[PDB]
Design a protein around this ligand. Structure first.
Ligand SMILES: OC[C@H]1O[C@@H](O)[C@H](O)[C@@H](O)[C@H]1O
Ligand SMILES: [Ca+2]
Length: 121
């Protein structure tokens, strides 16, 4: 399993100890408060009022928690995944990432605490 924090200002994301393999069932639970710039902070679902100005994940709000599995595109995690199975031919190490616009991570603050584990399958 993996337990740690994902820094909002870390554009390269947070590499976990989870290597997603075909058929794996995983659970993720994310918590905490972060910001993509403003003094206000948002949870793992991000800011539902802020327009997408070029986010790394166009399927989640700005400031939401997202992930990459191997060399995959960004996949929304938000508050978490419940006994989740990846799309076909998606595999590799899970990288957790704060959802923001490329080049604009420098002014981000806070972090999400996250747990990831592989489930019975
Ligand atoms: O839309 C994303 C952008 O939002 C702004 O409000 C913020 O100051 C920028 O750093 C960038 O994150
Ligand atoms: Ca920002």
């Amino acid at each position: 399993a993996w337990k740690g924090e994902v820094l909002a200002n870390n554009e390269a994301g947070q590499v976990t100890s989870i290597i997603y393999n075909p058929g794996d069932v995983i659970t993720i639970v994310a918590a905490g408060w972060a910001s993509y710039g403003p003094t206000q902070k948002w949870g793992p679902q991000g800011d539902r009022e802020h327009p997408d100005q070029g986010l790394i994940c166009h399927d989640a709000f700005c400031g939401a928690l997202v992930m990459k599995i191997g060399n995959s595109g960004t996949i929304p995690v938000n508050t978490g995944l419940f006994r989740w199975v990846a799309p076909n031919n998606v595999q590799g190490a899970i990288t957790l990432i704060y959802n923001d616009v490329p080049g604009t991570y420098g002014n981000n603050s806070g972090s999400f605490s996250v747990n990831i584990g592989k489930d019975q399958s």
